[PDB]
Design a protein around this ligand. Structure first.
Ligand SMILES: CC[C@H](CO)Nc1nc(NCc2ccccc2)c2ncn(C(C)C)c2n1
Lengths: 248, 325, 826
């Protein structure tokens, strides 16, 4: 019926990129750069956040079946965003994506697109569709962050602070392989959990079951804290590695 | 696995012939070599390279893998031409969308004039169509192109909805601009003639009602070549758009521009006096000018005309015999 | 685009309706006979009919009735066409000049309505206050006959009874009253209403509803002396009038369905009834007068008079003369005698009017080696079944071969100096357990005879029960000599085996010439036949010998010889068979993308397949591969009645809606899609139902015949006996003739003021389109019959294109020569 789009962290040691001699740090850097390229290009084009995320998910999935050494990331990213636009009904012309990609990339980077940028991108569309197995519909943590937040009742300002901080954590997790490890529903909870810890809020009280300490369970069944912590650990690592700090 | 689409080759199908020409590619009837099942294969050509893969096909792939219903066609898989070995840039082969094969199309059955529909047949037909439409509308998807050609029927009496190349998601909270005219002029709702552009799911209801009347008269209810002429024909039967029946008609861009000859009174019940009472009420509600006052799919399903229809008895339509030959 | 020309070689001959009245003069007795699109006016004499006038109408005549409103000296004529064109007509004569006046006219079609099962019904009030029309289920349309209603404006009255069988205006009522039989789930009923022109609605009718026979078919409005109505069924005849009820159920009428009625005595004492076996009856109203002075109806009696042709309309004229209007056989004048002849019959035939009947199939054959070609047609049905040999010589000479059984398909086998004809006759389950034929016929009067012994389907184990009296078809292959037209041999096919297709040909390396018949096993329980036989027969030395048989899993609807191979269509499948050196058929290749492959035609390695609803398909046999390829299909859905190949690119088809179309290869090789799309480039409303397209011409060819502008020759036969011809034109000749039509239409006055452009518009119930690619030759050939002032008016400002002279003005004498050459193609 439908494909399995989730892997175990241990499995990322065996992506095509890894086996061709790329080390874990480099593939991680390559993923962040490609995701951020997709994010930055589409933000410049005025694209909806779902469109940006869908492209990023295609991108991450793509390099579970292919190597970064044989497929230039920025071409792939541009192709993903191009397709994502058509899937999410926020379409863009390929020439405009190239134009923006040229604006944001230096000369070395734009060399990946080769002599004919549009062609390298449009040609890749075939591989992308076959690679993602024509499973185009994608759900993103954003919708669940809002579906769940709507059921919280309490201080309007404390909840809005929780949401925005968590929303920032969603945007940042797009630079990671979490999109490949955990369903979006879990991600939405994890970022609520993280923001709750950081803002010293006790979300249990805002729920319809103030006494159910495990508030995540009334939204997402069968999630141990083990998972929410692993996700939190992975999100905060990006901030510790980078100069950037937690939004608060 | 069954879920890894886009890799299996079209070699696995013996092509029987061309059933019809689709807008984004032609559709051919074929037999699966392994199972013997008959499937209809839609041709998707990206060789044009104007904008790559057709968005119309993208909509059908995105939506039909989400929609599961007896009255909604099932896309079985996506298969490809023998791809060029290790040279994707040279490769310009096309993709095929596999669908269940359907024996006949409604437009073809009406046009031959051979088919005869009893009340009970229509009940079985309308109940399936509305059940499919309700499923889709509940999933917040709009068909946007309900035509007799897009209604497919098996000789068993099973009905399925087909072309989704123009389908788009509807957001009730957020009104956003769409394509101004989607449904074919003969079955287009008045709001699209007047260019609402922020249309509601009620657009599909209007068409389905046009079909309801068509099953009884064996003739399309409103057929015209110009948008105003259709508005006049609709206006003669359903009444002229006016503020009393359509409070917000004044906000529609073309209300002042497009006017019927007269302010015609509604005559639907009179002109369809031959239609049974249970059905006539269904038509009056489906063919209501104001989209806000037009009945919903669920309301059409919770009907004296359709509620007590049992899908176990699908009433197979009248089959032409050798004597009919 | 494509350019073609269509002309009538023989006008419609079947009688569709007939009425009597005082139409030409308040003094004369007139007989008006209606053939499809044609009206014939006669005057009744003591010897027979005197023809006075014939007009064509741009429409199929659906309603024809004569009435005389107060203030008129003579009867007026109401006609409604099948496309709902209504008009009131008047005869006017000025010395030698006879013309037809259109007094009122209009189109009465409703935007929304369901066409009724029993067809258009039109009746007129005895006081001529209104015309009643039953066009749509659940609606009654009233045209009030006031002096001012020159446009025939009308209103609908809601009718609760949706399924009406028949309706008539009654006599002797205080208000206009309708009496009708209707059907609902509880059976059939007779009911009455009163029509109020003031209120524009029905009021309660004079007498109560009565439950009537399940197969009550016709309503007879009895005149003033009795009043009320008579209802004719399959088993009984009843009289209803308020409290009075009578029913006679004589066993004689149960035998054959009664289809037509007419009034002999104006007072209603005597009525004439006819049935599908041709039997003619007299229905008698036995009066009883009370001392009150009132006249009541005592009893009904039915008396058998004799045999006429199977009749669509009966009309009594005068004295003992009755006109028998026949659609399935030749029409007649017969005299009714008071004394029976020595055989017991009171009916003696006077004159016989040729009706080509239904033309089921036909072939063109040069019997006398004359380079001309004669047309042998399968004509008629049942007792009227006939072979008609037609040659040109200025009238068409027609010879009739009586068969007394239904002819189905015909093919000529020159090697045997004879024709092969498929026929079917009706037998009835008799007390022996077998069947008995109603009358002897060709298949039983053959010199030598044979019955198939094939055991292909003998395993049976499928039960088919028989009830005494049920009808069955018995199918035969007839061998008929080409000079004497004597039935030389008849081969009776298997029980419940229908013969559907027939070819005469050589196959493969076999020097013998065979008759090959494709059959189907027809059981009432089957929706589609699932068994069939392809039988190969050799006619040799007065005996037919079965050479081989092939079992198929369906009906062999159509067969055609294909370059030494046998191309046969079995249900969905189109199959090509090879004839082996062992004298057996072998499947070679198959094509399956058809719902029902009804018709097949070949040119070279190309095949044209005609489907019940999938229009037409162009196949190609690919010899290098040994299989079929789909070249192009016509996607527009049409119901097919006959197809033909005009040339390698143009294909002709006939619709069940009386329409013709021409498809062409789109000839643009840009994309695969364009080629595989057959583009309809010709649309034309013929007005006839075409059964058979046949290449050939009846015109004498001495080799000296001027090469006409027209190229090619396709003859076609129709259900109403009409024979037509289709031919192609050059782009220039078409544009010229088309521009002339538009000029002629402005000049020529139409009966009923019916626009010619509307009449020829393609018309399915669901879609209507303007004609294209076709020249109505019958309009062009009328240029020679319009007066000189009109001829010159037509040619004004008329220019030729792309000729010896690019622009060349036309004169009235130039066009007279052109049309006169166009009349030479038939
Ligand atoms: C006839 C127009 C219709 C429009 O989708 N095409 C069609 N028509 C179908 N019906 C069968 C048919 C065959 C030939 C002519 C018309 C209809 C059909 N069955 C499966 N499919 C797939 C592609 C969803 C079918 N698609």
């Amino acid at each position: 019926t439908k494909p399995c789009w989730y892997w175990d962290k241990k499995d990322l040691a065996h992506t095509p990129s890894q086996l061709e001699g790329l080390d874990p740090a480099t593939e991680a850097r390559y993923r962040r750069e490609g995701a951020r390229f997709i994010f930055d290009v589409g933000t410049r084009l005025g694209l909806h956040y779902d469109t940006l995320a869908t492209g990023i998910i295609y991108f991450h999935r793509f390099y579970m079946f292919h190597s970064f050494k044989q497929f230039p990331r920025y071409v792939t990213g541009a192709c993903c965003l191009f397709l994502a636009g058509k899937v999410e009904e926020t379409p863009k012309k390929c020439k405009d994506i190239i134009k923006t990609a040229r604006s944001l990339l230096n000369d070395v980077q734009f060399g990946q697109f080769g002599d004919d940028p549009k062609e390298e991108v449009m040609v890749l569309e075939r591989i992308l569709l076959q690679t993602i197995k024509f499973d185009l519909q994608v759900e993103h943590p954003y919708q669940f962050l809002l579906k769940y937040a709507k059921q919280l009742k309490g201080d309007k300002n404390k909840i809005q602070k929780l949401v925005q901080m968590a929303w920032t954590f969603v945007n940042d997790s797009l630079c990671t392989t979490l999109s490949l490890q955990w369903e979006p529903e879990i991600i939405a909870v994890a970022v609520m959990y993280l923001a709750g810890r950081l803002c010293k809020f006790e979300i249990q009280e805002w729920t319809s079951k103030p006494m159910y300490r495990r508030w995540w369970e009334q939204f997402v069944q069968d999630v141990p804290v083990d998972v929410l912590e692993d996700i939190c650990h992975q999100i905060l690592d990006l901030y510790s590695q980078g100069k950037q700090q937690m939004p608060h | 696995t069954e879920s890894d689409w886009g890799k299996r080759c079209v070699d696995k199908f013996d092509i029987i012939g061309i059933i019809g020409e689709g807008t984004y590619g032609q559709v051919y009837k074929a037999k699966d070599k392994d199972t013997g099942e008959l499937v209809a294969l839609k041709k998707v050509r990206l060789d044009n390279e104007k904008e790559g893969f057709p968005i119309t096909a993208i909509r059908e792939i995105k939506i039909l893998r989400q929609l599961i219903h007896r009255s909604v066609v099932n896309m079985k898989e996506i298969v490809t031409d023998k791809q060029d070995a290790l040279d994707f840039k040279k490769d310009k082969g096309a993709f095929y969308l596999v669908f269940e094969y359907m024996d006949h199309d409604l437009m073809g059955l009406l046009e031959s004039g051979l088919v005869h529909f009893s009340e009970d047949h229509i009940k079985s037909f309308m109940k399936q169509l509305m059940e499919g439409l309700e499923y889709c509308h509940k999933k917040n998807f709009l068909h946007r192109d309900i035509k007799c050609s897009n209604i497919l029927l098996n000789n068993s009496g099973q009905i399925k909805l087909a072309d989704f190349g123009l389908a788009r998601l509807y957001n009730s909270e957020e009104s956003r601009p769409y394509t101004n005219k989607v449904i074919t002029l003969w079955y287009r709702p008045p709001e699209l003639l007047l260019g609402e552009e922020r249309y509601t799911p009620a657009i599909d209801v209007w068409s389905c009602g046009c079909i309801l009347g068509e099953l009884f008269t064996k003739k399309p209810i409103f057929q015209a070549n110009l948008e105003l002429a259709q508005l006049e024909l609709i206006s003669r039967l359903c009444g002229s758009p006016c503020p009393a029946v359509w409070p917000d008609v004044i906000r529609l861009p073309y209300f002042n521009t497009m006017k019927p000859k007269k302010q015609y009174r509604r005559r639907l019940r009179e002109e369809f006096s031959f239609i049974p009472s249970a059905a006539l009420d269904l038509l009056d509600h489906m063919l209501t000018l104001d989209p806000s006052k037009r009945c919903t799919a669920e309301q059409t399903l919770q009907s004296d005309f359709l509620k007590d229809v049992e899908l176990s008895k699908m009433a197979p339509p009248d089959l032409p015999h050798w004597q009919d030959c | 685009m494509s350019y073609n020309y269509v002309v009538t070689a023989q006008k419609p001959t079947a009688v569709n309706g007939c009425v009597t009245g005082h139409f030409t003069s308040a003094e004369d007795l007139n007989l008006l006979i209606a053939k499809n699109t044609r009206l014939e006016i006669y005057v009744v004499t003591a010897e027979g009919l005197r023809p006075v006038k014939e007009v064509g109408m741009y429409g199929k005549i659906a309603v024809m009735e004569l009435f005389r409103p107060k203030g008129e000296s003579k009867d007026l004529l109401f006609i409604l066409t099948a496309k709902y064109n209504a008009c009131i007509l008047e005869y006017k004569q000025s010395g030698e000049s006879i013309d037809i006046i259109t007094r009122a006219h209009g189109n009465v079609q409703d935007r929304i309505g369901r066409p009724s099962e029993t067809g258009i019904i039109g009746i007129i009030d005895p006081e001529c206050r209104m015309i009643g029309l039953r066009l749509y289920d659940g609606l009654f349309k009233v045209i009030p006959l006031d002096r001012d209603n020159k446009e025939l404006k009308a209103f609908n009255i809601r009718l609760e009874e949706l399924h009406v069988i028949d309706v008539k205006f009654l006599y002797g009522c205080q208000a206009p009253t309708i009496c009708f039989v209707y059907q609902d789930p509880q059976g059939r009923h007779v009911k009455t209403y009163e029509v109020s022109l003031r209120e524009k609605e029905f009021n309660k009718g004079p007498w109560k509803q009565e439950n009537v026979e399940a197969e009550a078919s016709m309503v007879i409005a009895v005149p003033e002396p009795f009043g009320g109505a008579i209802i004719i069924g399959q088993e009984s005849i009843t009289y209803h009038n308020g409290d009075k009820y009578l029913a006679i159920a004589p066993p004689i009428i149960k035998q054959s369905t009664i289809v037509c009625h007419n009034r002999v005595d104006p007072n209603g004492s005597r009525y004439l009834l006819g049935d599908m076996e041709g039997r003619l009856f007299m229905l008698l109203l036995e009066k009883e007068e009370q001392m009150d002075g009132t006249v009541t109806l005592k009893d009904l009696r039915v008396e058998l008079l004799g045999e006429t042709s199977i009749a669509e309309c009966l009309t009594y004229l005068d004295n003992g003369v009755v006109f028998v209007g026949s659609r399935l056989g030749d029409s007649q004048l017969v005299k009714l005698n008071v004394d029976s002849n020595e055989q017991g019959s009171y009916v003696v035939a006077m004159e016989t009017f040729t009706n080509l009947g239904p033309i089921v199939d036909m072939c063109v054959v040069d019997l006398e080696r004359q380079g001309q070609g004669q047309l042998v047609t399968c004509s008629g049905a049942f007792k009227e079944g006939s072979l008609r040999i037609i040659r040109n010589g200025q009238k068409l000479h027609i010879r009739t071969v009586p068969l007394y059984e239904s002819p189905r398909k015909i093919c000529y086998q020159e090697v045997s100096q004879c024709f092969g004809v498929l026929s079917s006759r009706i037998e009835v389950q008799d007390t022996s357990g077998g069947t008995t034929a109603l009358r002897p016929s060709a298949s039983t009067q053959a010199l030598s005879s044979s019955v198939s012994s094939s055991k292909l389907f003998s395993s049976s184990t499928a039960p088919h029960e028989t009830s005494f009296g049920e009808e069955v078809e018995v199918h035969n292959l007839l061998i008929i000599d080409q000079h004497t037209f004597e039935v030389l041999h008849a081969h009776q096919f298997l029980q419940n085996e229908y013969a559907l297709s027939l070819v005469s040909c050589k196959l493969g390396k076999d020097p013998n010439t065979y008759f090959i018949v494709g059959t189907a096993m027809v059981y009432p329980e089957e929706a589609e036949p699932k068994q069939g036989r392809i039988v190969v027969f050799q006619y040799s030395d007065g005996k037919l010998q079965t050479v081989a048989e092939k079992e198929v899993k369906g009906a062999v609807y159509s067969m055609v010889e294909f370059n030494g191979k046998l191309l046969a269509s079995i249900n969905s499948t189109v199959r090509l068979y090879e004839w082996t050196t062992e004298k057996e058929l072998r499947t070679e290749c198959n094509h399956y993308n058809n719902i029902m492959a009804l018709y097949l035609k070949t040119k070279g390695d190309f095949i044209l397949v005609g489907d019940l609803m999938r229009s037409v398909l162009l196949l190609a046999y690919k010899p290098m591969e040994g299989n079929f390829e789909e070249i192009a299909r016509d996607f527009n859905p049409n119901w097919m009645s006959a197809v033909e190949i005009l040339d390698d690119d143009n294909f002709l088809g006939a619709e069940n809606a009386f329409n013709l179309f021409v498809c062409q290869k789109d000839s643009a090789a840009t994309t695969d899609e364009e080629r595989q799309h057959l583009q309809e480039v010709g649309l034309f409303h013929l007005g006839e139902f075409v059964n058979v397209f046949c290449h050939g011409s009846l015109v004498m060819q001495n080799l000296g015949e001027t090469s006409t502008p027209t190229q090619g020759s396709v003859l076609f036969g129709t259900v109403n006996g009409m024979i037509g011809l289709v031919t192609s034109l050059s782009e220039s000749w078409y544009n010229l003739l088309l521009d002339m039509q538009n000029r002629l239409n402005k000049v020529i006055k139409s009966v009923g003021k019916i626009e010619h452009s509307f009449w020829r518009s393609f018309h399915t119930e669901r879609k209507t389109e303007p004609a294209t690619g076709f020249i109505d030759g019958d309009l062009i050939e009328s240029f020679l019959d319009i007066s000189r002032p009109k001829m010159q008016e037509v040619v004004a400002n008329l220019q030729y294109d792309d000729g010896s002279g690019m622009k060349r003005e036309a004169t009235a004498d130039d066009l007279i020569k052109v049309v006169e050459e166009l009349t030479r193609i038939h």
